[PDB]
Amino acid sequence: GDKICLGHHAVANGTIVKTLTNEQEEVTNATETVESTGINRLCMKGRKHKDLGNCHPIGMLIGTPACDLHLTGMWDTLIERENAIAYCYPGATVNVEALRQKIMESGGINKISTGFTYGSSINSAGTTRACMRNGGNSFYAELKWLVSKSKGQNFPQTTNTYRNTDTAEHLIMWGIHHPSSTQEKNDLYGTQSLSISVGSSTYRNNFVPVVGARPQVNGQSGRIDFHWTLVQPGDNITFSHNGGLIAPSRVSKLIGRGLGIQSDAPIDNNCESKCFWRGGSINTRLPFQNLSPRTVGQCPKYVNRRSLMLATGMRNVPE
Amino acid sequence: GDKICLGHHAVANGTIVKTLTNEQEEVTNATETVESTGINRLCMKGRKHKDLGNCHPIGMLIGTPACDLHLTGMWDTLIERENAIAYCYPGATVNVEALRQKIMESGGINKISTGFTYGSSINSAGTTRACMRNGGNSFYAELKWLVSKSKGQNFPQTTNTYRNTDTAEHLIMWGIHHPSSTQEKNDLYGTQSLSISVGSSTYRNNFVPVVGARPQVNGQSGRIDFHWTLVQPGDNITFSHNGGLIAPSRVSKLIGRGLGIQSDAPIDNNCESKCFWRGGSINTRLPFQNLSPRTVGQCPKYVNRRSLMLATGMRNVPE
Amino acid sequence: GDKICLGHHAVANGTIVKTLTNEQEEVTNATETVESTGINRLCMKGRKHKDLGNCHPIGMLIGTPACDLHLTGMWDTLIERENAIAYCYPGATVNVEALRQKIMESGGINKISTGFTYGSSINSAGTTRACMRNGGNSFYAELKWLVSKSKGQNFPQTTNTYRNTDTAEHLIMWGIHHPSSTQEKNDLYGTQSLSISVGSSTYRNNFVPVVGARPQVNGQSGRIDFHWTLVQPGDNITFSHNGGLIAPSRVSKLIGRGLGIQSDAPIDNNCESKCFWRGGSINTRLPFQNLSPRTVGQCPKYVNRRSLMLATGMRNVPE
Amino acid sequence: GLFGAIAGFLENGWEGMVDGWYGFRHQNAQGTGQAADYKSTQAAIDQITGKLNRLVEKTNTEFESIESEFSEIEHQIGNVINWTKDSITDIWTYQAELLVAMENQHTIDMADSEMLNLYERVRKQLRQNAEEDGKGCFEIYHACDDSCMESIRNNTYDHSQYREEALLNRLN
Amino acid sequence: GLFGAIAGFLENGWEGMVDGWYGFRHQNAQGTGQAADYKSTQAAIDQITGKLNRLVEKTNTEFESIESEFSEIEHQIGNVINWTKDSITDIWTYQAELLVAMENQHTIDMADSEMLNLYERVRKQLRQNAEEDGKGCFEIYHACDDSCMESIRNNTYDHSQYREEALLNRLN
Amino acid sequence: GLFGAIAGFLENGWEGMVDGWYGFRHQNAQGTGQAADYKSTQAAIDQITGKLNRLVEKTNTEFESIESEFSEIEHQIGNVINWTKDSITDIWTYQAELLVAMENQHTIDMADSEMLNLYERVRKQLRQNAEEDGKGCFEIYHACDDSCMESIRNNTYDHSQYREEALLNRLN
Ligand SMILES: *[C@@H]1O[C@H](CO)[C@@H](O)[C@H](O)[C@H]1NC(C)=O
Ligand SMILES: *[C@@H]1O[C@H](CO)[C@@H](O)[C@H](O)[C@H]1NC(C)=O
Ligand SMILES: *[C@@H]1O[C@H](CO)[C@@H](O)[C@H](O)[C@H]1NC(C)=O
Ligand SMILES: *[C@@H]1O[C@H](CO)[C@@H](O)[C@H](O)[C@H]1NC(C)=O
Ligand SMILES: *[C@@H]1O[C@H](CO)[C@@H](O)[C@H](O)[C@H]1NC(C)=O
Ligand SMILES: *[C@@H]1O[C@H](CO)[C@@H](O)[C@H](O)[C@H]1NC(C)=O
């Protein structure tokens, strides 16, 4: 009548998990593998970062008023916002998306001065009420609006060339003005047919201002479309123009690498994180997450499930 | 002299399967995981669908004769065919593929009337034997071929604007005519240099008719190339032209979402399905399939194998 | 006092491996699954191959001097090099990358003759010191630089058409010359406004020479930009031009399929391989590799790890 | 195999057993019989069924086309699309192959374990009143009537009732 | 289950055992006691811990965006991006689902094995001085004092010391 | 481990055994010997070999380039390509890591099971003429000559021939 018995533990409330053979095994304990809660803020601790607020990354290169505080600097993450303004004077940039990406992966920009001069017969200081400053009418800080100094005069066939004397590639932006009327065109530039030709050792293209009636925005019915390339070290880029060019007073140099975040989430300098998205920041040790398909940084892989429990205990057999 | 023995069942013809350690284990039964047989027909039961036959999705927007029956309607799947015609009068559309995709993912289109008027000095009813109708020479149903009413006269500098008064984005197509001869150009429009300028708050572009000798197709040696954008609600789009524009009499509004199928397989209204391809339809519970890499809808994932057997039985040890 | 004991073998120096539960199990033997050593040479045994050296694949079609030996032939792998030259006279090709891919996946080209003739009023043999030959000034072997025979004369409105009489699609390249001065433009072609119009049953486009000051390269400040399409069998492609066209004396026909390798690694006709990359060749039975993310041919999948040991033995319990 | 029973100390299966996966053969006074164990059979089938339920039944995301079948598509983009689809197929086929290999290994081995589990059940229930043949048989050192056999297979056998009796034949 | 013990010949767990995963219940002269086996417990937890360490802790490659959240993106490229992200998500979710299913099966079964391993240890250590109940108990045919019980659970029990004594009650 | 034998009730391996993975050590009248079991050894190697065959040997689809090494490629498309390759690499590396981890677990555990299977074979073949040491040894209660040892390792040992003799030393 003497004996020893062997047994295993159990618990009153088991957790349910999936296995290869059984969709509902009760085990003693389990733990979540999919992260479903994130932080509703941008965790910027440990980062030299830049919140552009209503300044748009492109606006940094051309120099929109909104971006006055963001024309230069250095950083390791950049934060774009839904608001953001690039174009005070209405327009568009050819290959926009390639460009903001380039910028958003940069971690810093310097502005180098073109040294362009124009002088007599030509007014290099056109402004507009769409780009107001302190206050008053003004313009894109890194460009000059060139217009016939007088009248409704033919604009001089002009030549400016930027020489890259640096060791690194520079990024050159310029604008082409497209007026709303034949009259307007004639007032600013000649009656002459207009042509802007741009040429480096690697780049070559040409543009023609083009008149058309258009909805008023903001503002004006004119448009300034922007264009860009990279000028290699020790190369030169030459503008041949007879009016219509919005020329560069400065070119940009993109410096390092950096992480680009697009979110309206508030900054929080008191949490670290490596993974971000539109709704904010993600900090988790788990390999999987459920918050978003679109993340940036070092992130748990996205999955299409609320929960995936991993058993951390034996089969739970109560009584 | 008494005994009890334990055993397992077996079968005369086992099935062969792979394991981690043995490429050929005979087991008692197994079952296929890769679907290799599909249905040689399009299973349209339970779907408000549209077979365009020889009408091409683009032809729906501009109004080719082939598409007369398909200028409007509503659907939840759209069926394109290898035949299909978009251009009665020879030409091309800039960003075609983006456009048919847009259309093929739509599940319906409405046509809103532009209200454009032209009147004296201008013939708004050009036709061509490449776009025949009932029968007779005719044209794209949603566009007007505009030509100098008389002669070989300069076409009037003209302005038409479409105002989007709806709550949704409209899609505007238009054509630019490119003639085969200087003579032809002069007959239809002026001797004046030609220019078409198009401008909304978001869009702006311009086009120039261009003469050239070209192989005859169908038909004629002229070409009409098409162009498009989306006009946002409460926005306006303005055409400034002096000849060459194939203007829109109606614009299109893409309605919902829908599934786009490209296949020459016959319709069958008596099977359901959720997965389709060129050769037809796929109905299977299995997670994998072997028929095609290119499928649409809810499909088993494609794999590069005829067969992958899953054991549903023990090791089979006969005798 | 008699007994039998059971045991397993062991070794003095075990190998360490990962399992689901233990990141460091010592086992008796194991073997690597990730290939980390490759061959610093291009293993070409068993391949009809072509090393272009400093000839660039595009140069094969237009006929740069560097490519004189490579204007025709047949092969099953093609080797591009970092050096390589396509443009003796400075310029660019529209849709370059699509084109070299096409070429790099070809395994052979034939040159068919266009049969174009020009005759009086027109000099079909323009040359340049940027495309030197044996030695002397010369030009792209498969193209003609057309220029006003005399003077500063208006170039004749000209028409040439290539008829594809073959059973296969041909690839047609042509150039547009963009001069550095209004003077230069006038010397070579007229004072007339210039236009080149190109048209097949499938293709239609048009180009305008455009003057601009530009950095000197090599060489010269002019540029010749190239353009291409495929002309289907039994179809014709017509050039209408009044100067500026660099016309084709031959068109190309891409023959088979072939494997395109880009590497500066030396050829070795004494090893076979199926997998290559920039640094050379990869020969391994293992399913995974660590050398490069960018490979071509039949390759082990790339992974982000130096080592992943697979146990080929039991748990090693020494003493 | 992994659990030593099926294709192990049992040298073959029984083609005659058609009422279940696992079962008993007995020899006794009244002669021979055969019968299947429904409980272990169902343990094994239920687990196979669980595998099939997992295999079948997956919500799929909806995919729209990105390659036109009838148009020509631009060459570079077409090549990037092709690279991506090929890459994805290599992943799925690899996955499908591993799935089937590992499931199959596990399925075979669980089948071997359920067989052992039943064998072990019977051994335990006999305690000292029988000993192990080595080939799936238990040599019973007492008079085990057809009804007594049925008590083993019904798992209602009382070893105490035949114990001291059975402990005799033990030594002779 | 796979190793027959937990949810097998043991018909339930012991909610009272809070000092470990595995353990002993004894009945003897001085009455009843319960105690957990720290060594087998730790074998099982350490393996679970290994699983968690593998699960957590993975170096991730850095990803930058390719879809703009605030801009519009071109339609065709957007669709190709969408196809690719969707395709990749299907793969990861499938992966995650298989990972958890196969780990969970293995985790449950290794827990079962460690329980068996301990049972087998005790059985072997008793040799002939006890026999198998069939439900995780060993019926001890000799006076096993609380100290003697402890010698079993301490794995220091000498069967030789009680052998011939125990071999007696055997037959009566 | 999972099957309790290797790194379980056997506290170590035998560096001296170089003829095979598994084997016997005997002590008897004529002294000591060692020998490897070729059959169980080959069961284990063959399965390892099956794993290697699966690992090696995969038809690969052919991939052509989509990134030019020497040209510049457009920035947006380049970024999309990069996203896709990085994403695919994360999948393969995860896959490779799981493959090895799960294979290794299984490989170790099957090696354990083959060792057990052999041990269980011998136990069964001895029936009552020997009992279980608890550490991989069977204590033989009869004169087992070198030839008799060989009969065990040759799996030709007849327990009936030494049974009643062996059942004696049993009780003294
Ligand atoms: C660029 O500029 C200077 C004068 O502007 C000239 O000496 C230099 O050599 C030029 N370099 C190139 C690459 O054109
Ligand atoms: C478009 O035109 C209407 C008047 O026709 C005007 O009220 C509306 O605000 C205009 N919108 C834009 C964006 O120009
Ligand atoms: C192509 O050219 C030839 C002769 O110029 C002519 O016979 C044929 O009709 C043409 N074919 C097409 C499709 O234009
Ligand atoms: C992509 O693949 C299809 C068939 O698999 C082929 O027909 C087509 O030529 C390919 N396109 C490119 C650009 O490689
Ligand atoms: C791509 O995906 C997002 C959400 O999944 C959606 O908002 C967007 O419109 C999609 N675009 C296309 C073209 O499928
Ligand atoms: C794409 O990948 C390589 C390194 O893998 C790098 O050279 C390139 O600049 C990356 N591109 C971008 C645009 O982030």
Side-chain angles (χ1 to χ4, degrees), chain A residues 1-12 17-22 25-28 31-34 47 56 80-82 97 100-101 104-105 257-264 274 278 285-288 293-305 308-315 317-319, chain E residues 1-2 6-7 10-15 17 20-29 48 52 55-58 60-71 73 85 89-90 92-93 96-105 107-109 111 115 118-119 122 135-140 142-144 149 152:
Chain A
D2 286 314
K3 82 175 192 301
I4 201 160
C5 299
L6 276 82
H8 56 270
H9 76 137
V11 297
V17 307
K18 301 172 201 76
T19 65
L20 300 172
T21 54
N22 180 353
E25 293 270 21
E26 192 184 304
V27 293
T28 75
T31 196
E32 184 65 64
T33 68
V34 183
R47 305 182 97 115
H56 184 284
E80 204 193 316
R81 309 284 188 184
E82 197 171 3
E97 181 63 355
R100 55 172 282 291
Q101 280 179 15
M104 287 296 263
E105 57 195 47
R257 257 267 303 264
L259 182 69
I261 306 169
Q262 292 183 303
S263 184
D264 267 10
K274 276 180 144 22
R278 187 179 178 121
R285 280 289 158 178
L286 314 191
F288 310 123
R294 304 179 286 173
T295 70
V296 310
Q298 286 151 235
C299 293
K301 296 293 204 251
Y302 177 73
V303 297
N304 243 323
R305 289 210 172 208
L308 277 174
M309 297 304 296
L310 186 76
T312 59
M314 71 186 66
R315 202 126 38 176
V317 202
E319 263 184 346
Chain E
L2 195 75
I6 299 177
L10 310 157
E11 29 267 18
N12 56 261
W14 291 337
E15 294 201 22
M17 193 160 54
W21 286 28
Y22 311 107
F24 312 88
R25 281 203 215 270
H26 69 79
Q27 175 158 11
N28 74 344
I48 266 69
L52 296 171
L55 175 86
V56 161
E57 164 257 41
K58 294 194 214 283
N60 287 125
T61 59
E62 281 223 29
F63 291 89
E64 300 179 327
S65 76
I66 59 167
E67 284 171 288
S68 168
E69 299 285 321
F70 308 134
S71 316
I73 41 187
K85 292 203 172 158
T89 296
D90 278 354
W92 278 109
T93 85
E97 272 201 281
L98 174 67
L99 173 72
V100 143
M102 91 147 278
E103 295 279 15
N104 284 348
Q105 195 69 68
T107 290
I108 268 164
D109 289 334
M115 174 65 156
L118 170 64
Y119 181 85
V122 172
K135 299 171 149 30
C137 302
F138 292 112
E139 285 172 14
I140 305 174
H142 75 79
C144 195
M149 290 296 185
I152 289 169

Side-chain angles (χ1 to χ4, degrees), chain A residues 105 257, chain C residues 294, chain E residues 64, chain F residues 67 75 78-79 82:
Chain A
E105 57 195 47
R257 257 267 303 264
Chain C
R294 302 181 288 173
Chain E
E64 300 179 327
Chain F
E67 285 171 288
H75 195 263
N79 260 335
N82 271 350

Side-chain angles (χ1 to χ4, degrees), chain A residues 50 60 68-75 109-111 250:
Chain A
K50 177 152 222 149
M60 302 174 72
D68 278 327
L69 293 169
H70 302 317
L71 307 181
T72 30
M74 292 232 45
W75 56 86
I109 60 202
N110 294 350
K111 290 301 207 329
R250 285 159 112 206

Side-chain angles (χ1 to χ4, degrees), chain C residues 88-275:
Chain C
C88 48
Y89 189 97
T93 307
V94 177
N95 303 307
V96 240
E97 180 64 354
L99 188 69
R100 55 172 282 290
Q101 278 180 16
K102 230 141 179 17
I103 295 164
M104 287 296 263
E105 56 197 45
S106 71
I109 60 203
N110 294 350
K111 291 302 207 328
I112 317 306
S113 198
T114 47
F116 286 11
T117 57
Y118 308 89
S120 44
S121 64
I122 172 165
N123 171 14
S124 80
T127 59
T128 167
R129 217 146 224 167
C131 309
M132 284 178 304
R133 197 88 88 188
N134 255 268
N137 291 11
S138 186
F139 199 60
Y140 295 107
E142 310 296 41
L143 308 173
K144 303 290 180 64
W145 195 340
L146 314 184
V147 156
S148 272
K149 190 143 65 180
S150 268
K151 182 163 53 58
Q153 198 163 18
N154 286 12
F155 187 103
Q157 235 293 330
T158 308
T159 287
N160 298 262
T161 87
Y162 171 65
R163 174 172 69 95
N164 187 337
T165 73
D166 196 353
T167 55
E169 67 182 7
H170 299 322
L171 175 55
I172 333 299
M173 290 211 64
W174 67 92
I176 271 48
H177 179 228
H178 300 282
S180 39
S181 277
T182 313
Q183 190 138 9
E184 181 179 311
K185 184 234 141 192
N186 292 325
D187 291 340
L188 307 188
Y189 324 106
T191 52
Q192 50 184 7
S193 61
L194 295 175
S195 155
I196 299 93
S197 163
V198 184
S200 82
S201 303
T202 75
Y203 181 80
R204 99 144 198 76
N205 204 347
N206 67 307
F207 320 88
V208 187
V210 168
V211 173
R214 299 183 260 267
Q216 215 174 73
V217 171
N218 278 121
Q220 305 240 358
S221 268
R223 297 287 130 100
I224 293 181
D225 293 340
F226 303 88
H227 295 94
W228 59 282
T229 32
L230 300 164
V231 169
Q232 295 317 305
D235 195 19
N236 301 333
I237 188 173
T238 290
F239 296 84
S240 297
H241 57 335
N242 67 331
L245 168 67
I246 314 302
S249 67
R250 286 158 112 206
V251 309
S252 302
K253 171 183 179 182
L254 303 177
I255 300 166
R257 256 268 302 265
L259 183 68
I261 307 169
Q262 291 184 303
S263 183
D264 266 8
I267 290 196
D268 184 337
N269 267 306
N270 298 315
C271 43
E272 285 161 0
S273 183
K274 276 180 144 22
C275 179

Side-chain angles (χ1 to χ4, degrees), chain B residues 2-9 18-21 105 257 262 278 294 297-299 304-305 309 311 317, chain D residues 13-14 21 23-25 27-28 62-64 67 69 93 97 100 104-105 115 136-138 140 142:
Chain B
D2 288 317
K3 83 175 192 301
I4 202 160
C5 298
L6 276 82
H8 58 273
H9 76 139
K18 301 172 201 76
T19 65
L20 301 171
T21 55
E105 57 197 45
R257 256 268 302 264
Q262 292 182 302
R278 188 179 180 120
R294 303 180 287 174
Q298 286 151 238
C299 292
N304 243 326
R305 289 210 172 208
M309 297 304 296
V317 202
Chain D
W14 291 338
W21 286 29
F24 312 88
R25 281 202 215 271
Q27 175 158 12
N28 75 340
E62 280 223 29
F63 291 89
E64 300 178 327
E67 284 171 288
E69 299 284 321
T93 84
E97 272 201 281
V100 143
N104 283 350
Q105 192 70 69
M115 175 64 156
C137 302
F138 292 112
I140 306 175
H142 74 78

